[PDB]
Design a protein around this ligand. Structure first.
Ligand code: GDP
Ligand code: MG
Length: 169
């Protein structure tokens, strides 16, 4: 019946990984959540007629041992690769996340969704086209989000579950 899926939220610091996660889990926008805390959350949802239990890891970067990063990449079934639309470096970092996750999993086919967060902000430096083009080059969806207004948040997580299913199937 209920199937559990391991989702992993990755991206540079300050892009909104924790805020995205907390909107989905707790239905509010958090302004201040310590950037060094890495935690996981469970949430039950129904997607396309099938209940699933999302086990969501809100990552925070370096681990005590890199072996621990590798482990959560190996066990992770799908990845939300998050950048902020006002931070070009966070977008450029996506190249690294894509590479590293493929490398750890030794796979060319890893369920992922590219998330461009903070779309409510006017100070945009990363174009919709450049992100759409990058996602297309990986064969994955691109979704624009705002953890602040909740735009796209649910779609990003649900789409990732759909990508995981497509991969398993
Ligand atoms: N305006 C706006 N601020 C955001 C958004 N998402 C996150 N933030 C803020 O950006 C900062 C970093 O968010 P956080 O979730 O801690 O980023 P993390 O380091 O990736 O976990 C926080 O002050 C958040 O309130 C968003 O969509 N819009
Ligand atoms: Mg965080």
């Amino acid at each position: 019946g209920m199937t559990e899926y391991k989702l992993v939220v990755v991206g540079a610091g300050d892009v909104g990984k924790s805020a995205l996660t907390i909107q989905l889990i707790q239905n509010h926008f958090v302004d201040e959540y310590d950037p060094t805390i890495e935690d996981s959350y469970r949430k039950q949802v129904v997607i396309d007629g099938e209940t699933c239990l999302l086990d969501i890891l809100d990552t925070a970067g370096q681990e005590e041992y890199s072996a621990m990063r590798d482990q959560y990449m190996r066990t992770g079934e799908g990845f939300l690769c998050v950048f902020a639309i006002n931070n070009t470096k966070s977008f450029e970092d996506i190249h690294h996340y894509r590479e590293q996750i493929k490398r750890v999993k030794d796979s060319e086919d890893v369920p992922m969704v590219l998330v461009g967060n903070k779309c409510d902000l006017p100070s945009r430096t990363v174009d919709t086209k450049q992100a759409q083009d990058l996602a297309r080059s990986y064969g994955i969806p691109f979704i624009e989000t705002s953890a602040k207004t909740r735009q796209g948040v649910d779609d990003a997580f649900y789409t990732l579950v759909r990508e995981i299913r497509k991969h398993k199937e």
